[PDB]
Amino acid sequence: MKGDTKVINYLNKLLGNELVAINQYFLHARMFKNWGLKRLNDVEYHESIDEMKHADRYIERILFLEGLPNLQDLGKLNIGEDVEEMLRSDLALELDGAKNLREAIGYADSVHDYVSRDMMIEILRDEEGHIDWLETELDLIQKMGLQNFLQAQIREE
Amino acid sequence: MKGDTKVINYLNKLLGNELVAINQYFLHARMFKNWGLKRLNDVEYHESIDEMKHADRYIERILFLEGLPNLQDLGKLNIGEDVEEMLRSDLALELDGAKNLREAIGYADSVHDYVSRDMMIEILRDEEGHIDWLETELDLIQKMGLQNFLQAQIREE
Amino acid sequence: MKGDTKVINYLNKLLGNELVAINQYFLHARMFKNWGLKRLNDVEYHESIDEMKHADRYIERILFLEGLPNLQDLGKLNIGEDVEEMLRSDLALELDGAKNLREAIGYADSVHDYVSRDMMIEILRDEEGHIDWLETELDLIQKMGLQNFLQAQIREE
Amino acid sequence: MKGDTKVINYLNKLLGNELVAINQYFLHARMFKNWGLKRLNDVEYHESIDEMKHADRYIERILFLEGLPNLQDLGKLNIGEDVEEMLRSDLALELDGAKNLREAIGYADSVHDYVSRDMMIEILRDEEGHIDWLETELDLIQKMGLQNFLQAQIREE
Amino acid sequence: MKGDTKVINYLNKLLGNELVAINQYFLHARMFKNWGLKRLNDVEYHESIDEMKHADRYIERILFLEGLPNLQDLGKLNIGEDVEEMLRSDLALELDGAKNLREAIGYADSVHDYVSRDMMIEILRDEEGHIDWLETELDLIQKMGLQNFLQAQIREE
Amino acid sequence: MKGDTKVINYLNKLLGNELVAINQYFLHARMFKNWGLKRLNDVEYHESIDEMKHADRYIERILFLEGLPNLQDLGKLNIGEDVEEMLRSDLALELDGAKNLREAIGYADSVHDYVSRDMMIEILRDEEGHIDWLETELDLIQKMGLQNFLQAQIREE
Amino acid sequence: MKGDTKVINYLNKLLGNELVAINQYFLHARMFKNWGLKRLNDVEYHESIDEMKHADRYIERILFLEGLPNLQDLGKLNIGEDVEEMLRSDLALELDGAKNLREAIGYADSVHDYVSRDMMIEILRDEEGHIDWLETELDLIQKMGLQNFLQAQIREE
């Protein structure tokens, strides 16, 4: 079914955001794992999986609308070197992606692509959940101190 | 994640509507229970629980958006003294709450808080279900008469 | 069964105490949940439910005694802004409520309303349990320090 | 263990109340059963059994306290000839029994027989439950009319 | 179905016998229980229940035959103060009751109330079973001596 | 929660009574066991355990009220040398303890410590059950003679 | 079987040690419980139970040997006011008891009471296990600091 060209453009932009996040979350997860911070590996691994699911949804939607999914161009990663930097980088990436989602959701409505919009609202709900987790962890580091926070990560849940 | 100030205000207003409904539905249920009208107790109790779940959702959303949930102010209850009066009061409260929801849902869209909107639309769907039940019960009283209607309530369904 | 007017007045005052506590405990719970302090959310949520059960018993007893339950007036909440403040506010509310329960229990005995008295003694036993938990948590914050205390809350027991 | 003479006298008076109620509830039940009012038979039969249990408790307590249970004297029954008359007679008997219970409960406290008091408070709680049911049934007859009320009794609940 | 007036009169006399026996057996059971003679409590309690079942049958039959069951008048109890006295009193009561049953069975036959007769023959068979047990226990007391007999009662079979 | 000083003093006096009973019942139990009187060992062992549960309740209540449980002072035991002496000594101890409980229950009510009172009434009910068993055994020894009584103890129940 | 008088004297001395430990461990356990230190309550409670089992063994052995178990005299308790004091007091008590056990074990051998000796060696093995636990906890307090140690006690295992 031939979709709106700019809708497809937004879907490719959002897919691009998810592709950066998949890689950034996955590497962060395995850095945490290497450091013995098992609980952080578990959560970040699951966030990477969540973003893969989102990417799959964008890819399938673009193909249905007869566009070409772009998996070639990869945006800038910001890995970081310690726990706080890594979490802040993930939060910043999530915030940027949420801005793009809001723009795309408004546009899809204006051209009556309500199914693409509905998909994007569900994804935005998921991303706000990631944002809530990241903000919460960052605040916990400040409240209990980094040493107590690290100790809390060494055994799974 | 810092939310829009007026969105937070709307959520607190809607929370306020739920807090009134929680108490009014609960007291109505136990009044029905005292009178031996078990089926009406069962339904109204469940509606009270439903509004508690709505209140929980508003409280959690407000806190996420970094606002302060208002559980201090409580609007006017209208309890009534007989079955028809009690059900009509509940209906009037639901209709006023629906008006407030429609206004909030439109505004949330305008400022692109699509997740708050999605939550409110789900709540509005629940409230229209309560409105349907209440309108139906009131019409049944008129159709079969109050005496037959009350007899129908003395065993749970 | 027509009850003693002043017993009903006491029952309404105690119901009033429970209604403040329901709201305060629930908001505290969700504030803790937002901060990622899962254990504190779990306990405070269950205390809110306990106060709801107490309120239900008061409402049913008042109706049996042919009085009018008052769910319209809500007393002053004291939310607080940090963990120690919130816990101290809950403890102060519990202590005020226990004072009211003692007065009502003494009065019910003097007018031979032994069933109302029996109900209130069970509720007072529940409240003294909440007092014990709150005092214990506050002492633990002193003994192990706030940072260690917070770390201990981030996984559900 | 030798008990207080006046407490033993109270227990025998209360036992006497239970003995009247056992017979009156049982005959009412079987009258309802004859008339095809199965649901009223079920409830009144259960109330009769409840009073048998109370009588058993009085008999055992009296013997423990080294007194002589009096099962020889039987107070006046008031059977009645129609449903409303029968239920009102049961209610009147319950209310008279409750007055005697309150007097006995106060006196047992005065002579420090706290175990006899504890037993009586539990029994009074049961009696107030019967009073609640009776009052409710009588109000239902008034609200839905006798014909509708009788129709509602012909299937066991 | 309008029964024979004299049959109804006999059924009320027999009911009257059952009512005395219900109370006498039950008090005897609990006296035995107080004394630690568990086996005697168990048997006498079950005999009390058997007489309750008999009373229920009389009440239902009288009501079917359109008569008025008399539960108001209570004949003379003879409690006794020691085991042998109590058992002999129960036996004397059973023998008096069997006399009345024989008269009533003969009369019911003469007026063709064969269903009332059938009911009473079953009840008489039950009563002869109680007579057998009582006679046997009294004989055992004489044969093994009271002290051995009491020892044999201090556990439930 | 700071309790009343004299309530705490009563709780420690009652704890003292329980500590004596725990030891006396336990030694009596093992003396019975040594003699081959298994049934008496079983009951007295269980009574010792019951008193341990009571002691635990007093200890926990005292600590909650911010007092200091006294486990250092131990009252006078009266062991006895034969079955009758031992049981009579246990009975005298129980009677002394019930007297202290009655005084403490009255006082707790007067200072409005209704939860301490409720706990003590439950314990008093337990103690009256022990009194009943002890009185019953002593009477059985008289009624069947000591030789028959001992024979009845050599097999468990 | 008539035992050696001085063996019985040692068994009573050791029983005396166990009686002090039962009370000291139990009170310590409930102090820990009051403080919210659940893991310490659990272990100290179990140590109290272990000492009760030892006391039972001494009591039964003394009775077999035809001596008189002494449960009347209670040695000095040393409760303490904080975690470290309490644990050190328990350790000191265990060390004193172990000295007495070694003396008694040597003596029992010299008079050929090998079964009493065998019992005591098993008990000494148990006590050395308690000593190992107490020493370990005390060292942990020093190594991780008291605040970390307390935090580790708040959830069971």
Residue numbers in the entry:
A (entry chain E), B (entry chain A), C (entry chain B), D (entry chain D), E (entry chain C), F (entry chain F), ...: 1 to 157
The authors write:
Ferritins are iron storage proteins that overcome the problems of toxicity and poor bioavailability of iron by catalyzing iron oxidation and mineralization through the activity of a diiron ferroxidase site. The capacity of cells to store iron in a bioavailable and safe form is a central feature of the strategy nature has evolved to overcome the dual problem of poor bioavailability of iron and the potential of the free metal to catalyze the formation of reactive radical species. This function is fulfilled by the ubiquitous ferritin family, members of which are composed of 24 subunits arranged to form a protein shell surrounding a hollow center.
Rates for the five other Tyr/Trp variants were 70 % (W35F, Y10F, Y107F), 75 % (Y114F) and 85 % (Y149F) that of wild type BFR. These, along with previously reported structures of W35F and W133F BFRs and Y25F and Y58F BFR subunit dimers, showed that the substitutions did not cause any significant changes beyond the substituted side chain. EPR studies of the EcBFR variants revealed that Tyr25 is the site of radical formation; only in Y25F was the Tyr radical not observed.
